[PDB]
Amino acid sequence: NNLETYEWYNKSISRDKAEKLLLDTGKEGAFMVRDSRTPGTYTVSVFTKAIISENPCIKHYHIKETNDSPKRYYVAEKYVFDSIPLLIQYHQYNGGGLVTRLRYPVCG
Numbered sequence: 001n002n003l004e005t006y007e008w009y010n011k012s013i014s015r016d017k018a019e020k021l022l023l024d025t026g027k028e029g030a031f032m033v034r035d036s037r038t039p040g041t042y043t044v045s046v047f048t049k050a051i052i053s054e055n056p057c058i059k060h061y062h063i064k065e066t067n068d069s070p071k072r073y074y075v076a077e078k079y080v081f082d083s084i085p086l087l088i089q090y091h092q093y094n095g096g097g098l099v100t101r102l103r104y105p106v107c108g
Contacts (some may be wrong), residue, residue: 001082001083002042003042005092006084006107007043007104007106008029008045008084008088008106008107009034010034011035011107012034012098012101013034013045014034015045018034018043018106019040020108021106021108022045022047022050022106023047023050024108026049027046027103027104028103029099029103030046030047031098032044032046032060032086033045033101034074034108036080038065039064039065040065041062041063042063042073043061043062044057044062044091044102045060045061046060046061046103047059047099048099057099059099060073061076063084063087064077064080065080068080073087073099075098076096
């Protein structure tokens with residue numbers, strides 16, 4: 001289940017790089033992900049077309065894990081999943097709060 005393969009996943013990524021990659025993509029709600037280390041949760045870098053202080057804001061959401069069944073990972077003590085991809089795939093489609101529920105996974 002080792003992410004690595006999602007336009008949104010960004011291994012060894014940081015908070016600055018994702019934003020950088022985000023600011024590069026623009027897709028309001030640019031979705032990205034970055035591994036953490038804790039219980040095994042992954043990070044999700046979400047970016048809202050930003051180029052100044054107009055409004056556009058970036059957001060790095062971490063996918064919390066809760067002994068799957070029901071699901072484990074989540075980014076809002078909300079809808080949890082057995083993996084970021086599903087957790088992401090779930091946001092990318094259905095609702096799922098988040099800036100825009102995974103508007104466009106950034107892969108930089």
